[PDB]
């Protein structure tokens, strides 16, 4: 079985798992919609009461399973809870990352295609001295709409450009070239290059954005809006719903990806300090880097109220239309846009390999496929299924809700219950702390066993016909994966 080569490479690979497209596209929108600073306090609390303990739990479950040759949750749940229903629940740890990848790699290809076009200067050229922002936003809006082929009429049909489709082919090929080299020579080797690159690009963009100023505002105004606490909105449950959901999304928790990565950590190697360092690096890249780019740039040009209204228009609109349009009003702004989309591409690529590895690990561990065949069959499934996302409008929305939103939160609660309630709280705690360079504070034993599951349960309770096409297909994917698990059990 493969193993990570270096402790640093393991850290950077896990950091790249978490630091992805959602950290930079979705997190600023969610922070701005919920009052900025009024969102950061619950998010930080959700980082301490949900993100940190669930990260340690997934690290421990992964290393525990990998010790017996199993990297995915159908087998790992059954090891922790010897029950046929544990295998059925474990299927979600393959279905969630696969379905997410079926649209995630497509969005990743957007950022690559935009990086190419912005580097060569093939971008919309708004007329100078524009006294109206719409005359600048509209060329970039039509630019994205032509790239992905937004429907012009009532038919929910997307029409991707030829360039967008070719770039999606290249993007799949790049993911395959990394994954086919394996854990150490592929994912780990790429992480050691991509994470320093990602960090340097983000720091540069933060500095450049921080210098932005118009008569409508400054970047410091946006930072003040994002970091000034508002204790009145602590009463609102919706802020906690958004904060805990963002904790799942930014940390790649509940996607089965952390577990599979941790399955290549050796039996004796640390997971406490290593996991804490990976999660801390991700939060630095999320709240400090990602949150300090697009929202402060928007506030600098539009003011807080208009920037919030812009953020309500969605992650795609802010990331692919509004931010490049704002950049186009500055010297060297086309090159600044290229850096933004190159940052997004490396963040996406380090995350998409992470959510495609669970299916690869299942085929290797349980069906005994070679790495080459496992990676190629996984890529074929993702590439084929992605045509539903590329051509059917709102198919991505349905996949992102059922697998990317409902699925990840329920799966995080499920894995915690299996590990800390069914398998055994004391046994789980000793397995988490075994071989650690530092020990988890004893207070977290009662956070994992009582506070975290009660937190998730309470918040979950407080929480067109074409949609059935996507539902019918992802339900079929689940049935397909259940059949593969069935075939594995008949061979074992």
Ligand X SMILES: CC(C)C[C@H](N)C(=O)O
Ligand Y SMILES: CCCCCCCCO[C@@H]1O[C@H](CO)[C@@H](O)[C@H](O)[C@H]1O
472 contributes a contact to ligand Y by CB under 6 A? no
Task: Give the residue with the Cβ less far from ligand Y, 164 or 311.
Answer: 164
* Residue of 129, 131, 134, 162 that binds ligand Y (CB under 6 A): 162
448 contributes a contact to ligand X by CB under 6 A? no
From residue 233, how far is each of 39, 45, 48, 318 by CA, in Å? 8, 14, 19, 24
Stretch that binds ligand Y, among 158-166, 228-236, 400-408, 463-471 (CB under 6 A): 158-166
189 contributes a contact to ligand Y by CB under 6 A? no
Indicate the Cα dihedral angle 255, 260, 265, 271, nearest 10°.
Answer: 20
Total binding residues toward ligand X, as defined by CB under 6 A: 15
- The site map against ligand X for 251-270 (x = CB under 6 A) is -x--x-x-------------
What is the smallest separation between the CB atom of 106 and ligand Y, expressed in angstroms?
11
How far is residue 16's CA from residue 19's CA, in Å, rounded to a whole number?
5
Alpha helices per DSSP H over 366-451: 371-391, 395-401, 408-417, 425-433, 443-446
449 annotated among ligand-binding-site residues: no
Give which of Na ion, ligand Y, ligand X, none residue 162 binds (C-beta under 5 to 8 Å, depending on kind).
Answer: ligand Y
Cα angle vertex 26, ends 209, 57, to 5°? 115
What is the smallest separation between the CB atom of 162 and ligand Y, expressed in angstroms?
4
* Cβ pair 39, 223 in contact under 8 A: no
What is the smallest separation between the CB atom of 173 and ligand Y, expressed in angstroms?
16
Among residues 453, 418, 41, 26, the alpha carbon closest in space to that of 228 is found at 41
* Cβ pair 256, 55 in contact under 8 A: no
What is the smallest separation between the CB atom of 81 and ligand X, expressed in angstroms?
26
How far is residue 411's CA from residue 117's CA, in Å, rounded to a whole number?
39
351 contributes a contact to Na ion by CB under 5 A? yes
Residue number closest to ligand Y, CB atom? 160
* Residue of 99, 100, 321, 389 that binds ligand X (CB under 6 A): 100
Task: Give the residue with the Cβ less far from ligand X, 298 or 344.
Answer: 344
Q: Could you tell me if residue 428 is left (phi over 0), alpha (psi between -120 and 50 degrees) or otherwise beta? A: alpha
* Residue of 88, 139, 165, 377 that binds ligand Y (CB under 6 A): 165
- The site map against Na ion for 14-53 (x = CB under 5 A) is --x--xx---------------------------------
Give which of ligand Y, ligand X, Na ion, none residue 322 binds (C-beta under 5 to 8 Å, depending on kind).
Answer: none
Task: Give the residue with the Cβ less far from Na ion, 290 or 296.
Answer: 290
What is the smallest separation between the CB atom of 160 and ligand Y, expressed in angstroms?
4
Total binding residues toward Na ion, as defined by CB under 5 A: 6
* Sign of CA pseudo-dihedral 278, 282, 284, 289: positive
266 contributes a contact to ligand Y by CB under 6 A? no
What is the smallest separation between the CB atom of 247 and ligand X, expressed in angstroms?
10
* Cβ pair 396, 385 in contact under 8 A: no
- Could you tell me how far CA 334 lies from the centroid of its own chain? 26
DSSP one-letter string for 184-203? IIIIIHHHHHHHHHHHHHHH
How far is residue 266's CA from residue 1's CA, in Å, rounded to a whole number?
10
* Residue of 11, 22, 29, 399 that binds ligand X (CB under 6 A): 22
* Residue of 35, 160, 290, 303 that binds ligand Y (CB under 6 A): 160
3-state secondary structure 60-121: HHHHHHHCCCCCCHHHHHHHHCCCHHHHHHHCHHHHHHHHHHHHHHHHHHHHHHHHHHHHCC
DSSP one-letter string for 291-324? GGTHHHHHHHHH-HHHHHHHHTT-HHHIIIIIHH
What is the smallest separation between the CB atom of 199 and ligand X, expressed in angstroms?
15
- Could you tell me how far CA 310 lies from the centroid of its own chain? 22
331 contributes a contact to ligand Y by CB under 6 A? no
How far is residue 244's CA from residue 250's CA, in Å, rounded to a whole number?
10
Give which of ligand Y, ligand X, Na ion, none residue 350 binds (C-beta under 5 to 8 Å, depending on kind).
Answer: Na ion
274 contributes a contact to Na ion by CB under 5 A? no
- Could you tell me how far CA 91 lies from the centroid of its own chain? 20
Task: Give the residue with the Cβ less far from ligand X, 51 or 337.
Answer: 51
387 contributes a contact to ligand Y by CB under 6 A? yes
- The site map against ligand X for 213-252 (x = CB under 6 A) is ------------------------------------xx-x
Burial class (CB in 10 A: 0-12, 13-18, 19+), 119: middle
- The site map against ligand Y for 101-120 (x = CB under 6 A) is --------------------
* Residue of 354, 418, 432, 485 that binds ligand X (CB under 6 A): 354
Task: Give the residue with the Cβ less far from ligand X, 22 or 298.
Answer: 22
Summarize the annotated binding site as residue ranges: 84
Q: Which residues bind ligand Y (CB under 6 A)?
A: 160, 162, 165, 387
Residue ranges that bind Na ion, judged by CB under 5 A: 16, 19-20, 347, 350-351
Where do contacts with ligand X occur on this chain (CB under 6 A)? 18, 20-23, 100, 104, 249-250, 252, 255, 257, 351, 354-355
Which residues are part of a known binding site for phosphocholine? 84
């Amino acid at each position: 079985r493969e193993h990570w080569a270096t402790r640093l490479g393991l850290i950077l690979a896990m950091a790249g798992n978490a630091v992805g497209l959602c950290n930079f596209l979705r997190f600023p929108v969610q922070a701005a919609e919920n009052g900025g600073g009024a969102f950061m306090i619950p998010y930080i609390i959700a980082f301490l009461l949900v993100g940190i303990p669930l990260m340690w739990i997934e690290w421990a479950m992964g290393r525990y399973g990998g010790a017996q040759g199993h990297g995915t949750t159908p087998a790992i749940f059954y090891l922790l809870w010897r029950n046929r229903f544990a295998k059925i629940l474990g299927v979600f740890g393959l279905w969630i990352p696969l379905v997410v990848a079926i649209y995630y790699v497509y969005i990743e290809s957007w950022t690559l295609g935009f990086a190419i076009k912005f580097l060569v200067g093939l971008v919309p050229e708004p007329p100078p001295n524009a006294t109206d922002p719409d005359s600048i936003l509209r060329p970039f809006k039509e630019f994205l709409y032509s790239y992905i082929g937004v429907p012009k009429g009532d038919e929910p049909i997307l029409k991707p450009s030829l360039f967008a489709y070719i770039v999606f082919l290249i993007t799949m090929f790049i993911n395959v070239s990394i994954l086919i080299r394996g854990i150490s020579k592929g994912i780990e080797r790429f992480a050691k290059i991509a994470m320093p690159t990602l960090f340097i690009l983000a720091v540069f963009l933060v500095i450049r954005v921080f210098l932005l100023e118009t008569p409508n505002g400054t970047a410091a105004d946006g930072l003040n809006f994002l970091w000034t606490p508002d204790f009145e909105k602590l009463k609102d449950p919706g802020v906690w719903i958004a904060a805990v959901g963002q904790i799942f999304f930014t940390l790649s928790l509940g996607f089965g990806a952390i577990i599979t990565y941790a399955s290549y950590v050796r039996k004796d190697q640390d997971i406490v300090l290593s996991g804490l360092t990976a999660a801390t690096l991700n939060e630095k890249a999320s709240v400090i880097l990602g949150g300090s780019i697009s929202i402060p740039a928007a506030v600098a040009f539009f003011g807080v109220a208009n920037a919030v209204a812009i953020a309500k228009a969605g992650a795609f609109n802010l990331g692919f239309i509004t931010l490049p349009a704002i950049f186009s009003q500055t010297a060297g702004g086309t090159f600044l846009g290229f850096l933004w989309f190159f940052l997004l591409f490396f963040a996406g690529l380090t995350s998409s390999i992470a959510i495609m590895q669970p299916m690869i690990a299942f085929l290797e561990d349980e069906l005994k496929l070679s790495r080459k065949h496992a990676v190629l069959w996984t890529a074929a499934i993702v590439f084929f299924s992605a045509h539903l996302v590329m051509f059917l409008n709102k198919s991505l929305d349905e996949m992102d809700f059922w697998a990317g939103t409902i699925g990840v939160v329920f799966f995080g609660l499920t894995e915690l219950i299996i590990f800390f309630w069914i398998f055994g709280a004391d046994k789980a705690w000793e397995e988490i702390n075994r071989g650690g360079i530092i020990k988890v504070p004893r207070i977290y034993y009662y956070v994992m066993r009582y506070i975290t599951p009660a937190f998730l349960a309470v918040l979950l309770v407080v929480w067109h016909w074409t949609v059935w096409i996507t539902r019918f297909y992802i339900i079929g994917l689940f049935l397909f994966l259940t059949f593969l698990v069935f075939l594995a059990e008949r061979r074992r």
